[PDB]
């Protein structure tokens, strides 16, 4: 267990972090403090041409650049080593190897990557440096003091740069590479070049699904992408315009910097479309107006501004058109603004990818098994993520529905008040006919003023019985009852996700062990069997979860969804009937407000 | 690396799980399946007296009992070994060694322990077995298929049993033993016996704070206990009555079983006292009434039933007195029922223990350092837990306040409607005087009917200007504005807990490493220094957090609290003024409803 060293540092050779053709990178410590540092060792241009170039890099001080502290000579050989900032978490590759990131990073995490990569790039540019090969392996992750990832660039030895940035982001967004010959790019270097050159403009992906088969191009992100629609719509054009073949038509940096900053500077407002059963993230600038917001909601919901009715924390939200977004109420995915419309809409629900388990190859193979373990574990994470979202959609629906009924009831109580505000006036100016009567053209005139008036009271008896009928429907036994939502679908107390997470955790441990078993080239007899046992356990665990997922989570969800679609239908019919009833109270009120002063007479002297 | 074995199982001797004077327990595998099992090996009563006793235990099938599968003979010696259910998570001791449990288990986790221990005990009793020594080391934890802990009893070879159960529960509830001589019970066996025998009845703890110093007795749980007040009030009497010295006065099992089942059968309703700034868990039976609920709230809040005003999801909650608790709205700690009162109450806020860091002993000592690492890490977890709760209290306050203003506004709109419901009637029966007038005891009579009536309209001008004044205070610029709550205290976006958690995680890793360093009796030169380095890092991390905790989390919280206390004061004054104004509209309404038919005259023929 020998180790090399320098005056200030030392490191086991076993503790290697990275290996390149030019150099190796190990994890060592400062001899005097014990502090962890990354050691970059060159095993090996004239000597002082380098002493100069070392100084300028030493000057680089930036958040999204791995810090170069010092340059030392190893002790046994004089070859140059680099003492660099150690990143305990690893790299973006490490992250992307996580099964829970098998279908892309969470949106929140993705945004940190975007931010930090871009800031690092610009700093390089601001100093004239070019990073010929950006890639997930170049991008280190560290935990910031606030618990948030901070990403930092390393290993740099400009349109060409935009390409590898593009591939990385697609990879980061989806967990997969955008350009995939069958089996592998390496396996099919030739198929890959045709794909990249023959890529039609605007396209962001190209997939060969069969051997020597055609390429499925797409301008859209896969369904399995976790990024919100709001973001996909913004992200997509950037990729399309930096993944352009003819460099004649490339976008350029300043434009690139502007378009990404415009995204990064946007805040997110969480919106839930109650009639479509769809959650939405609205990406909007602080200084954009509510008018623009409504337009943005329409783009994702197809609800025109005039039809957009807003609900927040159990009550209506009325936005001044020109109200800036930074002054809006605080929202989360869990606490969104609900949108409803008085116009019928198709109930969509959650759209997700139907993904089945890959087959498990019985042939014992350390490299194959570890690769397989990742894929099968990745699906369940996705399945677990979908299960969570389905529940969220149901929980939000249930909350929103509860709130809307109370809102309608407010309207109902508002209108009942109005009726009782015009009954009173009407009664007084009719009971004041008779009282004044008991004080034949006159009588011929008054009967009209009476009969016609008595028709209004008669018209209100027809309203009264109809409101009581709406009240009847809003009551617990009413046909618009809430009870069903708690009888249908799934609830937190079912703990289906936790039930799935237990299975995922057993599977994830085995995956990591298989990952370990791979690095050790050969197993002992016993360890060989255990690998084969746990291989079978993997499939058993995956099969149980999927059965549970489809039979329990999805099935009960679709039943809840079908009941909602019809229940919505009822709600819309009621509001329309109430509105008609509301307007009649207004029509009556103004007809009564003319016969109130219908006091006309002319008198002698 | 030799290993023993039997026909069906084998196990490394290095992989030991437990060690007793009679036997050792190792973790092994089934030879044919590879499945993990606990192996209990006896190194060593007549032979078949045992073959019989083995069969009855083999029959025991229970959820809270570790399963005994089979009994085999080791291969090299014929001494008897036991194949038992392996519990991957470990024991309650393991759990209690976690720094985040240094001050007791989370309430939810504690309840699973209570449930599972009791069910296991009863099963033993139901079969006549006695478990002479229950203890945290006897109690194994496994993850249930729903992600919830399942606890299972093992290693059994009845008032006396209630004692060790009692100590365990106090230990589980607080993270500490109830009876503690200075330094240690073992260290002071003699001081301990005096404490246990000389313990005054009713007491649940006894602590010697100085060497040869007195004992601080307590009948209450420590402030640092995480259990809700609702539970403490229920748990305390059980402990007091099973920690009784004179076994003459012990409680007995049937009573014990009844009292605990009565607790376990209770559901929890989350309540937040908005005026006291205190969260509460109400432990109530499904079949108990709202009447009883209100009584239960009074016990924790001192708000009498009549004064209890309920709010849920932004709107008033009106409970039928006899409404059963199982039909109540769903609550969480995050989504509680808010309680308010029209009567002044002292603002309490969160009550927690002020705990400072222990001193770190510079003397390198593997046993001492590991013990110290736990304590100092335990405090920060507690500090982290308090930070989270303080934020929760602030977030809930902010939400509740937002809701209450809207509720008052509903009242305000309800009353404005009423005014406009009695103005209309009043106007009609006054404008109908004049209109009827233009058709001297009579005139002498009417002026009264006019003047007195005109006083009511004059009285309503005084109301109108006063309501507009209340409206003025409820508006954004109003003196009862919300804005301050977002300017004061702390918010989720500050990420103070996450900032603290980062520090806690660095500290926790070192603790676990120190725990590892202890087990290995001696360190190499390098490993020796690193232990000393990380020892210093521990203190540095702890000091930074505490500074951040006191200066940032607590300080801003207390400012928010002080502003709330005064803001509440304003709110109460307004509701009282509104009520007075509301009642005047009622007083006026009935005085106007008498002069409406004040139409009296007698006529010839
Ligand atoms: O590849 C290269 N350069 C960039 C990479 C090497 N450089 C650094 N690497 C780290 N850190 C690091 C790296 C890898 C893995 C990990 N961590 C893990 O894998 N973990 C963590 C426990 C979970 C597993 C951490 N820090 C600072 C630096 I500078 C090069 C190749 C050739 C020349 S340069
Ligand atoms: O002490 C005794 N009897 C009860 C205890 C031994 N019996 C069992 N013990 C386990 N499991 C187990 C135990 C200890 C530790 C752990 N796990 C850990 O420490 N972990 C997990 C990784 C985190 C660290 C698991 N299962 C099943 C059984 I039966 C006895 C002493 C003498 C006679 S009997
Ligand atoms: Cl590097
Ligand atoms: Cl045991
Ligand atoms: Hg990490
Ligand atoms: Hg996942
Ligand atoms: Hg998940
Ligand atoms: Hg009139
Ligand atoms: Hg596992
Ligand atoms: Hg565990
Ligand atoms: Hg904690
Ligand atoms: Hg915490
Ligand atoms: Hg009248
Ligand atoms: Hg650490």
- Percentage beta strand of chain A: 5-15%
Question: What about the largest sheet of chain A?
Answer: 7 strands, antiparallel
Structural class, judged by helices and strands of chain A? alpha+beta
Number of domains of chain A: 4
Chain pair sharing the greatest interface? A-B, 37 and 37 residues
**What ligand species are in this complex?**
ligand BX7, chloride ion, mercury (II) ion
Q: Please compute the radius of gyration of chain A using only Cα atoms.
A: 34 Å
Task: State the helix count of chain A.
Answer: 14
The CATH topology of the largest domain in chain A corresponds to: Substrate Binding Domain Of Dnak, Chain:A, Domain 2
CATH architecture grouping of the largest domain in chain A: Up-down Bundle
Helical content of chain A (DSSP H or I, runs of 4+) = 40-55%
The span between the termini of chain A is: 128 Å
How would the global form of chain A be characterised? elongated
CATH class of the largest domain in chain A, named Mainly Alpha
Oligomeric assembly:
homodimer
What is the total tally of β strands of chain A? 18
PDB class: transferase/transferase inhibitor
Keywords: kinase, TRANSFERASE-TRANSFERASE INHIBITOR complex
Assembly: dimeric
Entry title: Structure of Tank-Binding Kinase 1
């Amino acid at each position: 267990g020998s180790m090399q060293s320098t005056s200030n540092h030392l490191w086991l050779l076993s503790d290697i972090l990275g290996q390149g053709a030019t150099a190796n990178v190990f994890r060592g410590r400062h001899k005097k403090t014990g502090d962890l540092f990354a050691i970059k060792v060159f095993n090996n241009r004239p000597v002082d041409v380098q002493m100069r170039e070392f100084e300028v890099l030493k000057k680089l001080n930036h958040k999204n650049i791995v810090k170069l502290f010092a340059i030392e000579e190893e002790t046994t050989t004089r070859h140059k080593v680099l003492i660099m900032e150690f990143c305990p978490c690893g790299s973006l590759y490490t992250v992307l190897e996580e099964p829970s990131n098998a279908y892309g990073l969470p949106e929140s995490e993705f945004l940190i990557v975007l931010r930090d990569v871009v800031g690092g790039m610009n700093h390089l540019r601001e100093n004239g440096i070019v990073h010929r090969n950006i890639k997930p392996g170049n991008i280190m992750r560290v935990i910031g003091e606030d618990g948030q990832s901070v990403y930092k660039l390393t290993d740099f030895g400009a349109t060409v740069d935009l390409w590898s940035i593009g591939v990385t982001f697609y990879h980061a967004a989806t967990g997969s590479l955008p350009f995939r010959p069958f089996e592998g790019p390496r396996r099919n270097k030739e198929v890959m070049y045709k794909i990249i050159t023959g890529k039609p403009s605007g396209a962001i992906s190209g997939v060969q699904k069969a051997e020597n088969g055609p390429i499925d191009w797409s301008g859209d992100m896969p369904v399995s992408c976790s990024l919100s629609r709001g973001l996909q719509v913004l992200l997509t054009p950037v990729l399309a315009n930096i993944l352009e073949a003819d460099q004649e038509k490339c976008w350029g940096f300043d434009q690139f910097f502007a378009e990404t900053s415009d995204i990064l500077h946007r805040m997110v407002i969480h919106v839930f479309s109650l009639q479509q059963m769809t959650a939405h993230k609205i990406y909007i600038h602080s200084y954009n107006t509510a008018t623009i917001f409504h337009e943005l909601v329409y783009k994702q919901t197809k609800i025109i501004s005039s039809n957009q009715e807003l609900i927040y924390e159990g009550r209506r939200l009325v936005l001044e058109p020109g109200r800036l977004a930074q002054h809006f109420p605080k929202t989360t995915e869990e606490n969104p603004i609900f949108v409803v419309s008085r116009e019928p809409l198709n109930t969509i629900g959650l759209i997700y990818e139907k993904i089945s388990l890959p087959k498990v190859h019985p042939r014992y193979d350390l490299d194959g098994d570890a690769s397989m373990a990742k894929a099968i574990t990745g699906v369940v994470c996705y399945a677990c993520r979908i299960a969570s979202t389905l529940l969220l959609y149901q929980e939000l629906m249930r909350k929103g529905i509860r709130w809307l009924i109370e809102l309608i009831k407010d309207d109902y109580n508002e209108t009942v008040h109005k009726k009782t505000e015009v009954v009173i006036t009407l009664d007084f100016c009719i009971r004041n006919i008779e009282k004044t009567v008991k004080v034949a053209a006159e009588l011929g005139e008054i009967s009209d003023i009476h009969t016609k008036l008595l028709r209004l009271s008669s018209s209100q008896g027809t309203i009264e019985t109809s409101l009581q009928d709406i009240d009847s429907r809003l009551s617990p036994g009413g046909s618009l009852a809430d009870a069903w939502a708690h009888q249908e679908g799934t609830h937190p107390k079912d703990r289906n996700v936790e039930k799935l997470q237990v299975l995922l955790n057993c599977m994830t441990e085995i995956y990591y062990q298989f990952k370990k078993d791979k690095a050790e080239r050969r197993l002992a007899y016993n360890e060989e069997q255990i690998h084969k046992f746990d291989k079978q356990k993997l499939y058993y665990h995956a099969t149980k979860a999927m059965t549970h997922f489809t039979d329990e989570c999805v099935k009960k969800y679709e039943a809840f969804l079908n009941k909602s679609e019809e229940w919505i239908r009822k709600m819309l019919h009621l509001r329309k009937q109430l509105l008609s009833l509301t307007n009649q109270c207004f029509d009556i009120e103004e007809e009564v407000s003319k016969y109130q002063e219908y006091t006309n007479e002319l008198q002698e002297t």
